[PDB]
Amino acid sequence: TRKESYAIYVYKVLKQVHPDTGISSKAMSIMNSFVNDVFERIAGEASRLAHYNKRSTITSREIQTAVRLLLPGELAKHAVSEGTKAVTKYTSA
Amino acid sequence: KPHRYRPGTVALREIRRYQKSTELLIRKLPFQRLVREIAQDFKTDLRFQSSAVMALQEASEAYLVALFEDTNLCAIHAKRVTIMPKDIQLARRIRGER
Amino acid sequence: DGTLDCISMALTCTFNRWGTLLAVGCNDGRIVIWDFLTRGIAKIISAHIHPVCSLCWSRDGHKLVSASTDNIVSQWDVLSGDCDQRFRFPSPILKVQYHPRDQNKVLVCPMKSAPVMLTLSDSKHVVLPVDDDSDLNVVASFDRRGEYIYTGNAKGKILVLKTDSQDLVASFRVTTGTSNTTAIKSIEFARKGSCFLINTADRIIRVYDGREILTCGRDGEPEPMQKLQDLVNRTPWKKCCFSGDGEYIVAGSARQHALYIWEKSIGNLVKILHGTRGELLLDVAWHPVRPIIASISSGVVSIWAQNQVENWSAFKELDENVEYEERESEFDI
Amino acid sequence: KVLRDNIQGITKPAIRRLARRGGVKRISGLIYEETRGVLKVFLENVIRDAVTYTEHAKRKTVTAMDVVYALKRQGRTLYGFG
DNA sequence: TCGAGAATCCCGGTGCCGAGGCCGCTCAATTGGTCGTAGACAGCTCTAGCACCGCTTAAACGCACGTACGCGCTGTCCCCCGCGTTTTAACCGCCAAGGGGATTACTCCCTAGTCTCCAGGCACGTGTCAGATATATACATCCGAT
DNA sequence: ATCGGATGTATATATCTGACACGTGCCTGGAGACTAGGGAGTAATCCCCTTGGCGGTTAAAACGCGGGGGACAGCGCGTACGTGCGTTTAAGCGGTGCTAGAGCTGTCTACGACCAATTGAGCGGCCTCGGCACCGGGATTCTCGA
């Protein structure tokens, strides 16, 4: 059964931050579960706020607002800046 | 002459090494038997994943050490080093578990 | 609650059929038959040089089977004290037991071998079957009438055979709750009725009714009439026994030299008797027709009776104040 | 195969081990069984809810993802099991 | 308090399997049209908020003061820590059976989607009593002398 | 432990009313009827994880066993806190007035939706080998009696 995960991108960004490091597959699964958790969190919050806004379209403004609702302080600030830079890069082409 | 460390000291080192260690501190089979006993109460002859029951025991023990932790804290506020059941009860009370 | 100085090295005791005499074994290997009424020793028998660890009265009471630690079993007439018969085996004998309805027959539980039923008339022997063939430790007992043989192994397996054919009439394995077996420490029966008890290695006494095992058939799941234990101390039981009627059950905590007393129907603990904290509890027995209990600990026997409200409390004795019921003509002439 | 009394299968040494992990020095006896009770009560919920999932799952075996979604619904989510 | 002893840290060496790397092998990602539409936006209201200001007053701040709980200290009991011993069953390794879990392939029952019509719901008026409020009263309860 | 006095509180009363139950006309979501697809349901198959047992081990649990350590009870004092009474103060009513901004309608349009054609990024599966886990042994450091 074709099962999808992210541990490959985990290894990728690890090498991006720590090239000389290994991981326990256990820890990879833990991190992936964490990925899923934050994803469902942000998605549910975005859908809920759009419902409050009666919006049927979830866009990057919703993304940023919901992250700010979720992440604290500089975590949220850096995340907002990063998402902004990335969407700017993608929209540049 | 025989030597005996002062009280707590050995238990203190036990605390230190347990905060050092990370693995479980509960024997697997007894926990599993307890889980299945609890299960038959709601429905009999139900099977389980070893991963599932490992998760059960890990999450339990986590909740349990958290309870022990904040009850320790409360007993600090109780100015005692011995624990009292009322500490646990009222901790659950603050934990909304009442 | 009353001991006896006249006997020493008390190791094992056994009430007669009517609870009038008590044959106690001693470390010297002597039988001391002591009387309850005269409160004195009735007989001394040179049984063995080896201490006696198993003693049983005959139904008529005129025969006693004794087992030495020398693997020497011997029958003795209580009036004379002669060794009527004598046999020896391998795997030293753990227990002897007269057949309750045929004193010619006697079952013997050895240490490592299967229990064997012998007769006194003919020096023959019938080896009783073993379920797992590797128990090496099976206790066995006649029922109240001697019609069936209950054999329990170190692996919790329980076989009910018929005393004549040794055919498997019932079977079941007791559980430690979850899935495990437990060493069957002992099987006891009631001299009245059909309720019997099992002492096991789990320190939990299990009370059943043999009819329910018979109707349960071979390899069934019979539940106990009762489950009895020290939920407070989790104490083993060196020796237990019913009451004479069969509605009270006692257990001997050799760990702390105490005696627990529960009921049968409800099963609630009647009471607890505390002995000398320094004494090691060894043997326990109940008077068959009296609330009297004999205990053997550190070679010393103690007696535990139970008296009624009288012996000083018998005007008309009352317990609580009584409001006088005044009559209609209470003040009339 | 009817089970029972595995709650006391929890050893007092195990309890005190967990306590030392929690950083506790002196403990009373009255706790352990009390502790056990709580333990039971705690798990009292999840398994049921878990098998509730398995209830809707129409299956005879119980899986981890059950307790995952339970602890989630119990606000005590856990990682490392999908 | 300077040693003895004990639990621990660290070092080298052994052996291993998970971490990882690579390999077939897709289906899910991309690309590109195409379309109906979510909302972006403009452009109106209007109203609820926002501030203004005055008037009354219940409320707030501080005082003094009793006082009584917080706190600090002592001695006791008992009791839980530490260690020693004895017992056991968790574990671990292996085996085995099957029963359920997952899979795929059909098959079709039910729901989404459409269109019609109207009737229950909703905004909107409308008398109107449950209860808010005030007052005098009768009952309960504290606090201090006896 | 009681009684007397103070005080605070539950009660009946009266009326005021403004929420509130009630009724409307008008609107549109709900019902009713019809069509399609395809998620769901069923079944046969495979696998294979689980649940069961069996034997040996010991680390671990049970249990016992002092015994110093603190839980706890009590006991003195004192400082901080209730309290009732002062004081002054913003809080609330209320009513005024402006509008900034919600809050509504009407476009029109970019924007995914969606489908179709294409495929390589990714995933199950297969070696592989090296940090890592274990072990044994030596050296270090805490601790409890001087």
Short mmCIF file of N, CA, C and O in Angstrom, two decimals, chain C residues 115-170:
data_model
loop_
_atom_site.label_atom_id
_atom_site.label_comp_id
_atom_site.label_asym_id
_atom_site.label_seq_id
_atom_site.Cartn_x
_atom_site.Cartn_y
_atom_site.Cartn_z
N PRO C 115 0.51 -39.84 43.49
CA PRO C 115 -0.16 -40.46 44.64
C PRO C 115 -0.62 -41.87 44.30
O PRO C 115 -1.08 -42.13 43.19
N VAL C 116 -0.49 -42.77 45.26
CA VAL C 116 -0.83 -44.17 45.09
C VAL C 116 -1.79 -44.57 46.20
O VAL C 116 -1.61 -44.17 47.35
N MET C 117 -2.80 -45.35 45.84
CA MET C 117 -3.79 -45.82 46.81
C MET C 117 -3.52 -47.28 47.12
O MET C 117 -3.58 -48.13 46.23
N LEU C 118 -3.21 -47.57 48.38
CA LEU C 118 -2.92 -48.91 48.84
C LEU C 118 -4.06 -49.44 49.69
O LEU C 118 -4.96 -48.69 50.10
N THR C 119 -4.02 -50.74 49.95
CA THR C 119 -4.92 -51.37 50.90
C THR C 119 -4.10 -52.03 52.00
O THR C 119 -2.94 -52.38 51.80
N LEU C 120 -4.72 -52.19 53.16
CA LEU C 120 -4.04 -52.84 54.27
C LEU C 120 -4.23 -54.34 54.25
O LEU C 120 -3.30 -55.09 54.57
N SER C 121 -5.42 -54.81 53.88
CA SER C 121 -5.66 -56.24 53.76
C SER C 121 -4.63 -56.88 52.83
O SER C 121 -3.90 -57.80 53.22
N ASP C 122 -4.57 -56.40 51.60
CA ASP C 122 -3.56 -56.83 50.63
C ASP C 122 -2.59 -55.68 50.39
O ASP C 122 -3.02 -54.54 50.15
N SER C 123 -1.30 -55.98 50.44
CA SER C 123 -0.26 -54.96 50.26
C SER C 123 -0.10 -54.62 48.78
O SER C 123 0.99 -54.67 48.20
N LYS C 124 -1.22 -54.26 48.16
CA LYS C 124 -1.24 -53.83 46.77
C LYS C 124 -1.27 -52.31 46.71
O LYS C 124 -1.40 -51.62 47.72
N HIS C 125 -1.16 -51.79 45.49
CA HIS C 125 -1.13 -50.35 45.30
C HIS C 125 -1.58 -50.02 43.89
O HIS C 125 -1.22 -50.71 42.94
N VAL C 126 -2.37 -48.96 43.76
CA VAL C 126 -2.87 -48.47 42.48
C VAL C 126 -2.32 -47.07 42.28
O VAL C 126 -2.64 -46.15 43.05
N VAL C 127 -1.49 -46.90 41.26
CA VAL C 127 -0.91 -45.60 40.95
C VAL C 127 -1.95 -44.77 40.22
O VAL C 127 -2.44 -45.16 39.15
N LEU C 128 -2.29 -43.63 40.79
CA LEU C 128 -3.28 -42.78 40.16
C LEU C 128 -2.68 -42.04 38.97
O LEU C 128 -1.49 -41.71 38.98
N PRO C 129 -3.47 -41.79 37.93
CA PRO C 129 -2.92 -41.15 36.73
C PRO C 129 -2.51 -39.71 36.98
O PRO C 129 -2.94 -39.06 37.94
N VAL C 130 -1.66 -39.21 36.09
CA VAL C 130 -1.17 -37.84 36.12
C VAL C 130 -1.45 -37.22 34.76
O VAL C 130 -1.10 -37.80 33.72
N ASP C 131 -2.06 -36.03 34.75
CA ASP C 131 -2.46 -35.41 33.50
C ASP C 131 -1.25 -35.05 32.65
O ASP C 131 -1.08 -35.53 31.53
N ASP C 132 -0.37 -34.19 33.18
CA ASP C 132 0.70 -33.60 32.40
C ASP C 132 1.96 -34.45 32.37
O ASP C 132 2.90 -34.10 31.64
N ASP C 133 2.02 -35.52 33.17
CA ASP C 133 3.12 -36.48 33.16
C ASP C 133 4.43 -35.86 33.62
O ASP C 133 5.47 -36.53 33.63
N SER C 134 4.40 -34.58 34.02
CA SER C 134 5.61 -33.91 34.45
C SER C 134 5.37 -32.98 35.63
O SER C 134 6.14 -32.03 35.84
N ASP C 135 4.31 -33.22 36.41
CA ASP C 135 4.03 -32.35 37.55
C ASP C 135 5.06 -32.54 38.65
O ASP C 135 5.60 -31.57 39.18
N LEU C 136 5.30 -33.80 39.04
CA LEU C 136 6.27 -34.18 40.06
C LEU C 136 5.81 -33.70 41.44
O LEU C 136 6.41 -34.06 42.46
N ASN C 137 4.72 -32.94 41.49
CA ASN C 137 4.18 -32.45 42.75
C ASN C 137 2.66 -32.33 42.57
O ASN C 137 2.16 -31.32 42.08
N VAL C 138 1.95 -33.38 42.97
CA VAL C 138 0.50 -33.42 42.88
C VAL C 138 -0.04 -33.79 44.26
O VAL C 138 0.28 -34.85 44.79
N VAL C 139 -0.85 -32.92 44.81
CA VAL C 139 -1.56 -33.23 46.04
C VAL C 139 -2.85 -33.95 45.65
O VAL C 139 -3.37 -33.75 44.56
N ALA C 140 -3.34 -34.81 46.53
CA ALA C 140 -4.54 -35.58 46.24
C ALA C 140 -5.33 -35.80 47.52
O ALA C 140 -4.77 -35.82 48.62
N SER C 141 -6.64 -35.98 47.37
CA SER C 141 -7.50 -36.13 48.54
C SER C 141 -8.78 -36.85 48.16
O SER C 141 -9.30 -36.67 47.05
N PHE C 142 -9.29 -37.67 49.08
CA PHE C 142 -10.64 -38.19 48.94
C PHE C 142 -11.65 -37.07 49.17
O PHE C 142 -11.36 -36.05 49.80
N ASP C 143 -12.85 -37.27 48.64
CA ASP C 143 -13.95 -36.37 48.93
C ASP C 143 -14.54 -36.75 50.29
O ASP C 143 -13.97 -37.56 51.04
N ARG C 144 -15.69 -36.17 50.64
CA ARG C 144 -16.25 -36.39 51.97
C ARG C 144 -16.64 -37.84 52.19
O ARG C 144 -16.52 -38.37 53.30
N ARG C 145 -17.11 -38.52 51.13
CA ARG C 145 -17.53 -39.91 51.23
C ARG C 145 -16.50 -40.89 50.69
O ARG C 145 -16.74 -42.10 50.74
N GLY C 146 -15.38 -40.41 50.15
CA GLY C 146 -14.42 -41.31 49.56
C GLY C 146 -14.85 -41.89 48.23
O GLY C 146 -14.39 -42.98 47.87
N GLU C 147 -15.72 -41.20 47.50
CA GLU C 147 -16.19 -41.68 46.21
C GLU C 147 -15.36 -41.15 45.05
O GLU C 147 -15.35 -41.78 43.98
N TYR C 148 -14.69 -40.03 45.22
CA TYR C 148 -13.86 -39.46 44.17
C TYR C 148 -12.53 -39.01 44.76
O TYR C 148 -12.40 -38.79 45.97
N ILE C 149 -11.55 -38.87 43.88
CA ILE C 149 -10.20 -38.45 44.24
C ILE C 149 -9.90 -37.17 43.49
O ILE C 149 -10.00 -37.12 42.26
N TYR C 150 -9.53 -36.13 44.24
CA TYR C 150 -9.22 -34.83 43.68
C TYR C 150 -7.71 -34.65 43.73
O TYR C 150 -7.12 -34.69 44.81
N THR C 151 -7.11 -34.47 42.56
CA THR C 151 -5.66 -34.36 42.42
C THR C 151 -5.33 -33.03 41.77
O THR C 151 -5.81 -32.74 40.66
N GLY C 152 -4.51 -32.23 42.44
CA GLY C 152 -4.09 -30.95 41.92
C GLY C 152 -2.58 -30.88 41.75
O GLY C 152 -1.83 -31.23 42.66
N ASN C 153 -2.14 -30.42 40.58
CA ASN C 153 -0.72 -30.42 40.25
C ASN C 153 -0.10 -29.06 40.55
O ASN C 153 -0.78 -28.08 40.85
N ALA C 154 1.23 -29.01 40.44
CA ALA C 154 1.93 -27.74 40.54
C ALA C 154 1.58 -26.79 39.40
O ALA C 154 1.91 -25.60 39.48
N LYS C 155 0.92 -27.28 38.35
CA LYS C 155 0.54 -26.46 37.21
C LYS C 155 -0.95 -26.17 37.18
O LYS C 155 -1.54 -26.06 36.10
N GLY C 156 -1.57 -26.06 38.35
CA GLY C 156 -2.96 -25.66 38.45
C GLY C 156 -3.97 -26.61 37.86
O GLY C 156 -5.17 -26.33 37.92
N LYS C 157 -3.54 -27.74 37.31
CA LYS C 157 -4.48 -28.69 36.73
C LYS C 157 -5.10 -29.54 37.83
O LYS C 157 -4.41 -29.98 38.76
N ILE C 158 -6.40 -29.79 37.70
CA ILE C 158 -7.21 -30.43 38.72
C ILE C 158 -7.95 -31.57 38.04
O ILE C 158 -8.74 -31.35 37.12
N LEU C 159 -7.69 -32.79 38.50
CA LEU C 159 -8.33 -33.99 37.99
C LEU C 159 -9.21 -34.58 39.08
O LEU C 159 -8.79 -34.72 40.23
N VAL C 160 -10.44 -34.93 38.70
CA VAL C 160 -11.36 -35.62 39.59
C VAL C 160 -11.53 -37.00 39.00
O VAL C 160 -12.09 -37.16 37.90
N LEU C 161 -11.01 -38.00 39.70
CA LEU C 161 -11.11 -39.40 39.32
C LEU C 161 -12.13 -40.08 40.21
O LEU C 161 -12.50 -39.57 41.27
N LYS C 162 -12.59 -41.25 39.78
CA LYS C 162 -13.40 -42.08 40.65
C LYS C 162 -12.50 -43.02 41.43
O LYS C 162 -11.58 -43.62 40.87
N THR C 163 -12.78 -43.14 42.73
CA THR C 163 -11.85 -43.81 43.64
C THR C 163 -11.63 -45.27 43.27
O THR C 163 -10.58 -45.83 43.59
N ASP C 164 -12.60 -45.89 42.61
CA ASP C 164 -12.50 -47.32 42.32
C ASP C 164 -11.80 -47.59 41.00
O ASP C 164 -10.95 -48.48 40.93
N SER C 165 -12.12 -46.82 39.97
CA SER C 165 -11.60 -47.06 38.63
C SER C 165 -10.47 -46.13 38.26
O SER C 165 -9.81 -46.36 37.24
N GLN C 166 -10.23 -45.08 39.05
CA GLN C 166 -9.25 -44.05 38.73
C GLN C 166 -9.54 -43.40 37.38
O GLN C 166 -8.64 -42.82 36.76
N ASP C 167 -10.78 -43.49 36.92
CA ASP C 167 -11.16 -42.91 35.64
C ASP C 167 -11.45 -41.42 35.81
O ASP C 167 -12.01 -40.99 36.82
N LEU C 168 -11.06 -40.65 34.80
CA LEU C 168 -11.18 -39.20 34.85
C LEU C 168 -12.65 -38.82 34.76
O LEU C 168 -13.25 -38.84 33.69
N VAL C 169 -13.25 -38.45 35.90
CA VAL C 169 -14.66 -38.07 35.90
C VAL C 169 -14.85 -36.57 35.76
O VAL C 169 -15.96 -36.12 35.42
N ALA C 170 -13.81 -35.77 36.01
CA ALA C 170 -13.89 -34.33 35.81
C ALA C 170 -12.48 -33.78 35.70
O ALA C 170 -11.51 -34.41 36.13
#
